[PDB]
Design an enzyme around this catalytic site. Structure first.
Site, PDB file in Angstrom:
ATOM      1  N   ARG C 103      10.762  -4.889 -44.073  1.00 51.86           N
ATOM      2  CA  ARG C 103      11.516  -6.081 -44.533  1.00 51.86           C
ATOM      3  C   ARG C 103      10.640  -7.338 -44.381  1.00 51.86           C
ATOM      4  NH1 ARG C 103      15.730  -2.745 -44.204  1.00 51.86           N
ATOM      5  NH2 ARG C 103      17.406  -3.285 -45.658  1.00 51.86           N
ATOM      6  N   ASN C 135      14.584 -13.729 -53.855  1.00 53.61           N
ATOM      7  CA  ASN C 135      15.123 -13.279 -52.544  1.00 53.61           C
ATOM      8  C   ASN C 135      13.992 -12.928 -51.579  1.00 53.61           C
ATOM      9  OD1 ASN C 135      18.007 -13.462 -52.138  1.00 53.61           O
ATOM     10  ND2 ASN C 135      18.136 -12.228 -54.007  1.00 53.61           N
ATOM     11  N   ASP C 163      27.702 -15.511 -55.442  1.00 48.68           N
ATOM     12  CA  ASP C 163      28.637 -14.796 -54.523  1.00 48.68           C
ATOM     13  C   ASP C 163      30.035 -15.371 -54.740  1.00 48.68           C
ATOM     14  OD1 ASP C 163      25.827 -15.127 -53.311  1.00 48.68           O
ATOM     15  OD2 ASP C 163      26.557 -13.387 -52.151  1.00 48.68           O
ATOM     16  N   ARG C 166      31.441 -14.133 -58.102  1.00 43.88           N
ATOM     17  CA  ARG C 166      31.935 -12.733 -57.937  1.00 43.88           C
ATOM     18  C   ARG C 166      33.297 -12.753 -57.237  1.00 43.88           C
ATOM     19  NH1 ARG C 166      25.893 -10.954 -56.543  1.00 43.88           N
ATOM     20  NH2 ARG C 166      25.377  -9.826 -58.436  1.00 43.88           N
ATOM     21  N   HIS C 190      23.383 -15.819 -48.772  1.00 42.32           N
ATOM     22  CA  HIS C 190      23.538 -14.974 -49.979  1.00 42.32           C
ATOM     23  C   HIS C 190      23.623 -13.506 -49.533  1.00 42.32           C
ATOM     24  CE1 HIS C 190      23.064 -13.258 -53.840  1.00 42.32           C
ATOM     25  NE2 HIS C 190      21.890 -12.750 -53.544  1.00 42.32           N
ATOM     26  N   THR C 245      20.220  -6.762 -61.079  1.00 37.31           N
ATOM     27  CA  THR C 245      21.220  -7.661 -61.699  1.00 37.31           C
ATOM     28  C   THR C 245      20.466  -8.777 -62.406  1.00 37.31           C
ATOM     29  OG1 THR C 245      21.636  -9.335 -60.034  1.00 37.31           O
ATOM     30  CG2 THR C 245      22.595  -7.135 -59.626  1.00 37.31           C
TER      31      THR C 245
HETATM   32  N1  LIG Z   1      20.103 -15.348 -46.053  1.00 32.05           N
HETATM   33  S1  LIG Z   1      18.710 -14.498 -46.340  1.00 32.05           S
HETATM   34  O1  LIG Z   1      17.616 -15.209 -47.058  1.00 32.05           O
HETATM   35  O2  LIG Z   1      17.978 -14.107 -45.133  1.00 32.05           O
HETATM   36  C1  LIG Z   1      19.085 -12.969 -47.211  1.00 32.05           C
HETATM   37  C2  LIG Z   1      19.065 -11.786 -46.489  1.00 32.05           C
HETATM   38  C3  LIG Z   1      19.329 -10.588 -47.182  1.00 32.05           C
HETATM   39  C4  LIG Z   1      19.603 -10.589 -48.557  1.00 32.05           C
HETATM   40  C5  LIG Z   1      19.871  -9.234 -49.260  1.00 32.05           C
HETATM   41  C6  LIG Z   1      19.318  -9.239 -50.719  1.00 32.05           C
HETATM   42  C7  LIG Z   1      17.991  -9.167 -51.221  1.00 32.05           C
HETATM   43  C8  LIG Z   1      16.745  -9.018 -50.563  1.00 32.05           C
HETATM   44  C9  LIG Z   1      15.682  -8.607 -51.318  1.00 32.05           C
HETATM   45  C10 LIG Z   1      14.453  -8.435 -50.716  1.00 32.05           C
HETATM   46  C11 LIG Z   1      14.267  -8.688 -49.359  1.00 32.05           C
HETATM   47  F1  LIG Z   1      13.036  -8.501 -48.813  1.00 32.05           F
HETATM   48  C12 LIG Z   1      15.311  -9.103 -48.579  1.00 32.05           C
HETATM   49  C13 LIG Z   1      15.153  -9.364 -47.194  1.00 32.05           C
HETATM   50  C14 LIG Z   1      16.269  -9.686 -46.456  1.00 32.05           C
HETATM   51  C15 LIG Z   1      16.214  -9.977 -45.115  1.00 32.05           C
HETATM   52  C16 LIG Z   1      15.017  -9.937 -44.446  1.00 32.05           C
HETATM   53  O3  LIG Z   1      15.092 -10.246 -43.075  1.00 32.05           O
HETATM   54  C17 LIG Z   1      14.012  -9.813 -42.301  1.00 32.05           C
HETATM   55  N2  LIG Z   1      12.735 -10.149 -42.433  1.00 32.05           N
HETATM   56  N3  LIG Z   1      12.056  -9.501 -41.458  1.00 32.05           N
HETATM   57  N4  LIG Z   1      12.961  -8.774 -40.732  1.00 32.05           N
HETATM   58  C18 LIG Z   1      14.162  -8.965 -41.225  1.00 32.05           C
HETATM   59  C19 LIG Z   1      15.499  -8.397 -40.708  1.00 32.05           C
HETATM   60  O4  LIG Z   1      16.316  -7.820 -41.484  1.00 32.05           O
HETATM   61  O5  LIG Z   1      15.796  -8.556 -39.480  1.00 32.05           O
HETATM   62  C20 LIG Z   1      13.861  -9.629 -45.152  1.00 32.05           C
HETATM   63  C21 LIG Z   1      13.935  -9.350 -46.512  1.00 32.05           C
HETATM   64  C22 LIG Z   1      16.550  -9.261 -49.215  1.00 32.05           C
HETATM   65  N5  LIG Z   1      18.053  -9.216 -52.552  1.00 32.05           N
HETATM   66  N6  LIG Z   1      19.358  -9.395 -52.935  1.00 32.05           N
HETATM   67  C23 LIG Z   1      19.806  -9.385 -54.217  1.00 32.05           C
HETATM   68  N7  LIG Z   1      20.956  -9.856 -54.685  1.00 32.05           N
HETATM   69  C24 LIG Z   1      21.228  -9.618 -55.947  1.00 32.05           C
HETATM   70  C25 LIG Z   1      22.516 -10.108 -56.537  1.00 32.05           C
HETATM   71  O6  LIG Z   1      22.674  -9.917 -57.761  1.00 32.05           O
HETATM   72  O7  LIG Z   1      23.389 -10.624 -55.788  1.00 32.05           O
HETATM   73  C26 LIG Z   1      20.313  -8.896 -56.688  1.00 32.05           C
HETATM   74  S2  LIG Z   1      19.069  -8.534 -55.550  1.00 32.05           S
HETATM   75  C27 LIG Z   1      20.130  -9.371 -51.837  1.00 32.05           C
HETATM   76  C28 LIG Z   1      21.669  -9.544 -51.770  1.00 32.05           C
HETATM   77  C29 LIG Z   1      22.385  -8.201 -51.663  1.00 32.05           C
HETATM   78  C30 LIG Z   1      22.949  -7.609 -52.951  1.00 32.05           C
HETATM   79  C31 LIG Z   1      23.883  -8.319 -51.965  1.00 32.05           C
HETATM   80  C32 LIG Z   1      19.601 -11.795 -49.263  1.00 32.05           C
HETATM   81  C33 LIG Z   1      19.353 -12.989 -48.586  1.00 32.05           C
HETATM   82  F2  LIG Z   1      19.378 -14.164 -49.284  1.00 32.05           F
HETATM   83  N1  LIG Z   2      19.447 -15.569 -55.736  1.00 33.07           N
HETATM   84  C1  LIG Z   2      20.191 -14.614 -56.294  1.00 33.07           C
HETATM   85  O1  LIG Z   2      21.425 -14.619 -56.257  1.00 33.07           O
HETATM   86  C2  LIG Z   2      19.516 -13.490 -56.942  1.00 33.07           C
HETATM   87  C3  LIG Z   2      18.173 -13.392 -56.816  1.00 33.07           C
HETATM   88  N2  LIG Z   2      17.450 -12.421 -57.449  1.00 33.07           N
HETATM   89  C4  LIG Z   2      15.991 -12.346 -57.221  1.00 33.07           C
HETATM   90  O2  LIG Z   2      15.316 -12.652 -58.411  1.00 33.07           O
HETATM   91  C5  LIG Z   2      13.953 -12.184 -58.267  1.00 33.07           C
HETATM   92  C6  LIG Z   2      13.542 -11.603 -59.581  1.00 33.07           C
HETATM   93  O3  LIG Z   2      14.446 -10.503 -59.869  1.00 33.07           O
HETATM   94  P1  LIG Z   2      13.985  -9.607 -61.111  1.00 33.07           P
HETATM   95  O4  LIG Z   2      13.744 -10.469 -62.316  1.00 33.07           O
HETATM   96  O5  LIG Z   2      14.921  -8.444 -61.182  1.00 33.07           O
HETATM   97  O6  LIG Z   2      12.497  -9.243 -60.607  1.00 33.07           O
HETATM   98  P2  LIG Z   2      11.203  -8.663 -61.383  1.00 33.07           P
HETATM   99  O7  LIG Z   2      10.349  -7.992 -60.346  1.00 33.07           O
HETATM  100  O8  LIG Z   2      11.709  -7.953 -62.596  1.00 33.07           O
HETATM  101  O9  LIG Z   2      10.392  -9.916 -61.936  1.00 33.07           O
HETATM  102  C7  LIG Z   2       9.877 -10.964 -61.079  1.00 33.07           C
HETATM  103  C8  LIG Z   2       8.749 -11.627 -61.823  1.00 33.07           C
HETATM  104  O10 LIG Z   2       7.980 -12.411 -60.872  1.00 33.07           O
HETATM  105  C9  LIG Z   2       6.664 -12.411 -61.367  1.00 33.07           C
HETATM  106  N3  LIG Z   2       5.700 -12.928 -60.410  1.00 33.07           N
HETATM  107  C10 LIG Z   2       5.134 -12.262 -59.352  1.00 33.07           C
HETATM  108  N4  LIG Z   2       4.220 -12.962 -58.725  1.00 33.07           N
HETATM  109  C11 LIG Z   2       4.157 -14.156 -59.436  1.00 33.07           C
HETATM  110  C12 LIG Z   2       3.378 -15.330 -59.286  1.00 33.07           C
HETATM  111  N5  LIG Z   2       2.444 -15.493 -58.357  1.00 33.07           N
HETATM  112  N6  LIG Z   2       3.579 -16.342 -60.163  1.00 33.07           N
HETATM  113  C13 LIG Z   2       4.504 -16.175 -61.117  1.00 33.07           C
HETATM  114  N7  LIG Z   2       5.288 -15.127 -61.354  1.00 33.07           N
HETATM  115  C14 LIG Z   2       5.070 -14.140 -60.475  1.00 33.07           C
HETATM  116  C15 LIG Z   2       6.440 -10.945 -61.725  1.00 33.07           C
HETATM  117  O11 LIG Z   2       5.270 -10.752 -62.488  1.00 33.07           O
HETATM  118  C16 LIG Z   2       7.739 -10.668 -62.498  1.00 33.07           C
HETATM  119  O12 LIG Z   2       7.548 -10.857 -63.903  1.00 33.07           O
HETATM  120  C17 LIG Z   2      13.968 -11.204 -57.077  1.00 33.07           C
HETATM  121  O13 LIG Z   2      13.349 -11.800 -55.938  1.00 33.07           O
HETATM  122  C18 LIG Z   2      15.469 -10.958 -56.859  1.00 33.07           C
HETATM  123  O14 LIG Z   2      15.821 -10.607 -55.529  1.00 33.07           O
HETATM  124  C19 LIG Z   2      18.091 -11.510 -58.269  1.00 33.07           C
HETATM  125  C20 LIG Z   2      19.394 -11.368 -58.219  1.00 33.07           C
HETATM  126  C21 LIG Z   2      20.243 -12.441 -57.692  1.00 33.07           C
END
Ligand SMILES: NS(=O)(=O)c1ccc(Cc2c(-c3ccc(F)c(-c4ccc(Oc5[nH]nnc5C(=O)O)cc4)c3)nn(-c3nc(C(=O)O)cs3)c2CC2CC2)cc1F
Ligand SMILES: NC(=O)C1=CN([C@@H]2O[C@H](COP(=O)(O)OP(=O)(O)OC[C@H]3O[C@@H](n4cnc5c(N)ncnc54)[C@H](O)[C@@H]3O)[C@@H](O)[C@H]2O)C=CC1
Ligand SMILES: NS(=O)(=O)c1ccc(Cc2c(-c3ccc(F)c(-c4ccc(Oc5[nH]nnc5C(=O)O)cc4)c3)nn(-c3nc(C(=O)O)cs3)c2CC2CC2)cc1F
Ligand SMILES: NS(=O)(=O)c1ccc(Cc2c(-c3ccc(F)c(-c4ccc(Oc5[nH]nnc5C(=O)O)cc4)c3)nn(-c3nc(C(=O)O)cs3)c2CC2CC2)cc1F
Ligand SMILES: NS(=O)(=O)c1ccc(Cc2c(-c3ccc(F)c(-c4ccc(Oc5[nH]nnc5C(=O)O)cc4)c3)nn(-c3nc(C(=O)O)cs3)c2CC2CC2)cc1F
Ligand SMILES: NC(=O)C1=CN([C@@H]2O[C@H](COP(=O)(O)OP(=O)(O)OC[C@H]3O[C@@H](n4cnc5c(N)ncnc54)[C@H](O)[C@@H]3O)[C@@H](O)[C@H]2O)C=CC1
Ligand SMILES: NC(=O)C1=CN([C@@H]2O[C@H](COP(=O)(O)OP(=O)(O)OC[C@H]3O[C@@H](n4cnc5c(N)ncnc54)[C@H](O)[C@@H]3O)[C@@H](O)[C@H]2O)C=CC1
Ligand SMILES: NC(=O)C1=CN([C@@H]2O[C@H](COP(=O)(O)OP(=O)(O)OC[C@H]3O[C@@H](n4cnc5c(N)ncnc54)[C@H](O)[C@@H]3O)[C@@H](O)[C@H]2O)C=CC1
Lengths: 331, 331, 331, 327
Positions: C103, C135, C163, C166, C190, C245
């Site tokens: 992670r 994320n 969120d 939803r 989130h 998503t």
């Molecule tokens: N408040 S926060 O920044 O710390 C945080 C934590 C965790 C998440 C989980 C998460 C990740 C996500 C991806 C990659 C990651 F690497 C992480 C991540 C989360 C926690 C981490 O914490 C740690 N770092 N080192 N150790 C830890 C630990 O767990 O103790 C590291 C990576 C999350 N993506 N993601 C997406 N959402 C959608 C959507 O459509 O809603 C599509 S994808 C989701 C939400 C889940 C679907 C409901 C979303 C958040 F915003």
């Molecule tokens: N905040 C939210 O509620 C949500 C956040 N996300 C986040 O959106 C992000 C993208 O999701 P997807 O499009 O499905 O991912 P994806 O992996 O399909 O695309 C991400 C893009 O980032 C680009 N990228 C990587 N390094 C880069 C750099 N240095 N400069 C510019 N572009 C660079 C990649 O080439 C790729 O085209 C993820 O981190 C995902 O977790 C998605 C769902 C909901």
């Protein structure tokens, strides 16, 4: 503390310039139709209204404000003082005198010149970089007047011109062919109203020349009398004026269309009133409608339409008539 | 052959029913503001206008028609004859008498009843399945009148009611808090205008009760005088009437908002005027604004708001006053 | 002369006024792009990625749809000079989770991407608002703030806007009411650790908690807690079903962009620097209701939380600060 | 009682329904474009891949707060498509390595053999909008299997090709594509015909100003604009693997004209037997008037001998492929 301060923690005192501000000067039926059309197309982050009639001005501003829930334009302001118009990208002039019993048509024009003498320098002081969109009639003459008084370059002084005349042409064309006006193409150029020129050669559906299919198009020989379409462009305007007392809805929509091209920098082509000295053998400082490219700097370019000698002659005569009236005006 | 026939090969004759038709009866400032708002929100494939004043009616229809190029509503029609209204999904009544010098307020109401006596049966004959949206004042009483004359079920007779009063409340709330009216929640229920009830308990930003933060909210002891917000809901309406002579833009936008929920079957909640016998101890056939779910069948459901004894008492008093006026009207 | 010069007389030689950049043209960035284009929020859209072919192909695909859009300039490149003079810059760039990757490693890889992105964004648009989507969104918003050196008003995480959307969808399915009319806030982190504020859940300003005091507890016969469980689980479900998503987040981001570009001052649950609130003593970003306009976050709403709700945010802050201390980047 | 019943006192068919069959990148781009233009009160999605289908439906549903389309449904069963005004077919097979182009077509015919009778059973009065390639051939296929009259079977055709033409025209002239007029007709893609005679800004014939326009002698090489109409499509496919956004926007534009009965003129694929000397049952793009009954009318464009020849050749080639297909 106050309810506001219990509910809301403030991060910044910053005041901040409006980024997409439009002013409408003159809040008659035309100005307000421009305003509602602009509000309903989300073209402005700030709408400023100006008039000399304080009660009408305040009442119109408030009525729009009460609709804020249903709009995406977060600031609507009004005042007689041109400080409310500061930092306008676009300022639309729909201000005019009401024709009096026992007054000549030259006197009505001069009275509108005297209104422009007050309005234009105030607009320029508070929005030195704005585009001026002139709607007030006589629109080709008053666009000239606004250019002279403003000292703006010709790109930033635009008359609404034949944008509405062209829209009426297309409506009527559409009724004859059973096709939406969007898909019916046809240009009315030169003067707004009575002396406007229909360019029969440009009339088309799907790039098919109607003139080529029907060479009598726009002549007196024509068995189908297509000339009647251009006659109705002029007469239908007089008809609406006779029937309801004025026109508002069509011009408001037309102006919102020009405003859209300017505020979004679209570079769409509209028949608007621009300074045409140097073209079609016109040697005087007059404004006539030709197709212009509209964007964030106003008119950047204009289209050189191929006219017949007869069409060219009609514009030359219009320029002579407009220069004649313009020489008789007092600044 | 004709130019049309040289240019266009026809595949099919018969032109079917309109699928999303709206009629506006009464082309005053209110009906035309409803019309332009509906046209600019693309809620109708056909807009029909009706009035008794033939010139105003034709002139307004033509002015809109001249704007067709800028709209996405392909058929705009008018007439005195209700055959132009056939197959309307939604019929908006903005028709009303002009108050005469010396005329009593009961007489003005009866004159609007007599207008409804002609309008409503004609609307029903040509659009037996339509929803009726009543705007004409007095709106709660005339919604009752339209229900009785139409014989429609109560789901398909809707008064515009407190949708505008609620929008004004939220505008004013927004000015005090520096927050968009969309994000400022607050309900005005019961009668349109003077006797409307602000439900202080429902006033919130982000689900945070203003009443809970500030228990004096909506009492006379309140140092911030939040009651003045509801006073301004009533007084600002009278102010616009004093300043420009009438209101148009805010009601037009409000009606377009209700029309949107109905035409698109959104099932959004609006404070509109519905038959409320059986609720809050009301035993008479009266229409008052409560929050209703609006969709393709009109009012499908209503929200049971928890009122204080005082709020409940104000609706009961409104019902008594409305039943009293209603039993004095002649059908 | 050339066809262009025969057809067009140029008046002036040619800055974007409403420019948006999207960094990362994955499914999320492109859903943001199409939503922004279809809402007319920009006069210029700039795309950036590291994958040059995908970037060019996506830019071309959008460009080919220009006829159907009102955004006159669409540009792309790996060089941040194409992003110059952006009002708003949306970061959707991210690394793809690997099998066996920890992670902390995934987070650090996204930090290293931000190390390259953020300083380049700042050089070419020193006055822009940053909208962080990537994320983990709350942590990476912190990271973007520290690397950018921007004031906290101009660094925004998309946070719980999705969120909350939803939550309202699910609320709407249970009540048979449109999500627009169903009010309910998810705050804090989130995803998994998000906090549903049961006290704010209302239709028409009517507290569901007051009607049903078991709302959001384990005693609840109707199991309303399952609504918040589904807010988290439905996101995992869509990821399991289609692999990712895109559509909902794209629409959510376009909604925030709309508030920013039009200066609406609407209230959204976005991720902002929350040290000093709910007894949080560390530099962490969590979702609270913020007022969004042309300067980003101008104000926060102070929601009244239960001790349990306050405790969940404090725990989230502790967890986020713990991860943040273990990351490597320069401020 | 329940919270719902404590909160809500109850007092009491979709009117503007669109179905999209095939939830690949193309179907979903059509769906988001349709949702963002408010053309439907109900959107139905169908596919054979149940998980992808459910996931796409849910992802759109989660965005409901931001939309004004109150009902989004999916399933493999065509009962979810009942009472559609408009049904958009973006369903197709993926080309396999070494598979012949006639085999790919036949595989898409077999998909239409399942899809079209199910669409017809649940929406007997719908307009069919065919997007799947090869689009002119598969429009013919949908017409034959459906038994619909020709007004209610429409191919997306050269609506996208015409949009690309105008984009490129606009780049050359420094004018918005809305203000740049020009028609690509006949087949979608490689064999499309640019009608140089109709290329205009503000009703000014570019051909009249520059008679070399669309000839090989042309010093400005305007033919390169039409070459790029075909090549830019291949370029996007090479660069990102497929096209989605432009076709999605194009289909939403046709859907807008149909759902709102606009009677705007679009270059779409229609049954052209009897016109431009075509004697076979083939679909080619000519300018059609689109409204609530589909294609009500055609515009009879005056073509050059060369333009006429390209359509007749296209008809011959399409009839040749079509007579070899198995129903
Ligand atoms: N408040 S926060 O920044 O710390 C945080 C934590 C965790 C998440 C989980 C998460 C990740 C996500 C991806 C990659 C990651 F690497 C992480 C991540 C989360 C926690 C981490 O914490 C740690 N770092 N080192 N150790 C830890 C630990 O767990 O103790 C590291 C990576 C999350 N993506 N993601 C997406 N959402 C959608 C959507 O459509 O809603 C599509 S994808 C989701 C939400 C889940 C679907 C409901 C979303 C958040 F915003
Ligand atoms: N905040 C939210 O509620 C949500 C956040 N996300 C986040 O959106 C992000 C993208 O999701 P997807 O499009 O499905 O991912 P994806 O992996 O399909 O695309 C991400 C893009 O980032 C680009 N990228 C990587 N390094 C880069 C750099 N240095 N400069 C510019 N572009 C660079 C990649 O080439 C790729 O085209 C993820 O981190 C995902 O977790 C998605 C769902 C909901
Ligand atoms: N090219 S130009 O600038 O000089 C010019 C001349 C005339 C007019 C006519 C005119 C006037 C108009 C008002 C006030 C005026 F003072 C004049 C005017 C008329 C004649 C003039 O010249 C003289 N006539 N008699 N003597 C003279 C003289 O001065 O020598 C001067 C002004 C016109 N308004 N107006 C409106 N249009 C609409 C609409 O919906 O389209 C609604 S109102 C119209 C058009 C009419 C509907 C068809 C529109 C134009 F743009
Ligand atoms: N619940 S109700 O149906 O019975 C009812 C009663 C009173 C009114 C007041 C009213 C009238 C109105 C017009 C015509 C009428 F004939 C009446 C009216 C007044 C009193 C009446 O009956 C009596 N009650 N007690 N005695 C009498 C009597 O008959 O004398 C009947 C009608 C009001 N218009 N109108 C407008 N609003 C706007 C706007 O922008 O919001 C613009 S105009 C308003 C609202 C006020 C501006 C804020 C609005 C309502 F909806
Ligand atoms: N008028 S027609 O119906 O007969 C027809 C023929 C060919 C095509 C080409 C085609 C195919 C396509 C897929 C699958 C196929 F199987 C075929 C195909 C090609 C040739 C065929 O005929 C023959 N194969 N072998 N011999 C023959 C013969 O000539 O006898 C059959 C199928 C094309 N997809 N596709 C896409 N376009 C886009 C976009 O954004 O525009 C994205 S993808 C395109 C357009 C090209 C990118 C510009 C589009 C069309 F509409
Ligand atoms: N260009 C076109 O195609 C069309 C132009 N018009 C023109 O638009 C103009 C306005 O028409 P209406 O709104 O119906 O007229 P109106 O008489 O109702 O309104 C004009 C407004 O200008 C205001 N005004 C006058 N002097 C002013 C000053 N010094 N400062 C500020 N405001 C001032 C008046 O108070 C009035 O409210 C007329 O000139 C009319 O001919 C109308 C229709 C179409
Ligand atoms: N419910 C609300 O919130 C609001 C309601 N209104 C009401 O809207 C109504 C119209 O207001 P205005 O436009 O200012 O009035 P107006 O007097 O300008 O126009 C009303 C129109 O009704 C027409 N009419 C009269 N008898 C008719 C009949 N038998 N058939 C068809 N049309 C007929 C008249 O000819 C006139 O054009 C008024 O009753 C007003 O109080 C206005 C403000 C807000
Ligand atoms: N007419 C035009 O201008 C253009 C047409 N297209 C065409 O769009 C079509 C789809 O493109 P993509 O989305 O990229 O393809 P894709 O292969 O990603 O998606 C097609 C979908 O059809 C589904 N499908 C297959 N058999 C089915 C059946 N029996 N019932 C229901 N669904 C079924 C598949 O499961 C898949 O999800 C292709 O034929 C492509 O050539 C593409 C761009 C432009």
């Amino acid at each position: 503390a106050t309810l506001k301060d219990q509910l809301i923690y403030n991060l910044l005192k910053e005041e901040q310039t409006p980024q997409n501000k439009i002013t409408v000067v003159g809040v008659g039926a035309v100005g307000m139709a421009c305003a509602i059309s602009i509000l309903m197309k989300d073209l402005a982050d700030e709408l400023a209204l100006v008039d000399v009639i304080e009660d009408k001005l305040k009442g119109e501003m408030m009525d729009l404000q009460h609709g804020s829930l249903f709009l995406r334009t977060p600031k609507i302001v009004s005042g007689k003082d041109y400080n409310v118009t500061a930092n306008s990208k676009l300022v639309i002039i729909t201000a005019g005198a009401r024709q009096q019993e026992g007054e000549s048509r030259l006197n009505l024009v001069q009275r509108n010149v005297n209104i422009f003498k007050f309005i234009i320098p105030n607009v320029v002081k508070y929005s030195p970089n704005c585009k001026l969109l002139i709607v007030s009639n006589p629109v080709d003459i008053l666009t000239y007047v606004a250019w002279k008084i403003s000292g703006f370059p010709k790109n930033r002084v635009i008359g609404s011109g034949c944008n509405l005349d062209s829209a009426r042409f297309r409506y009527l064309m559409g009724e004859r062919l059973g096709v939406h006006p969007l898909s019916c193409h046809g240009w009315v150029l030169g003067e707004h109203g009575d002396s406007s020129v229909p360019v029969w050669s440009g009339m088309n559906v799907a790039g098919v020349s109607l003139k080529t299919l029907h060479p009598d198009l726009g002549t007196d020989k024509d068995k189908e009398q297509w000339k009647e379409v251009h006659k109705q462009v002029v007469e239908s305007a007089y008809e609406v004026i006779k029937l309801k007392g004025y026109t508002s809805w069509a011009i408001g929509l037309s102006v919102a269309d020009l405003a859209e091209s300017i505020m979004k920098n679209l570079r769409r082509v509209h028949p608007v009133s621009t300074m045409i000295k140097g073209l079609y053998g016109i040697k005087d400082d007059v404004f006539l409608s030709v197709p212009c490219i509209l964007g964030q700097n106003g008119i950047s370019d204009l289209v050189k339409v191929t006219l017949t000698s007869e069409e060219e002659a009609r514009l030359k005569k219009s320029a002579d008539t407009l220069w004649g009236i313009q020489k008789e005006l007092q600044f």
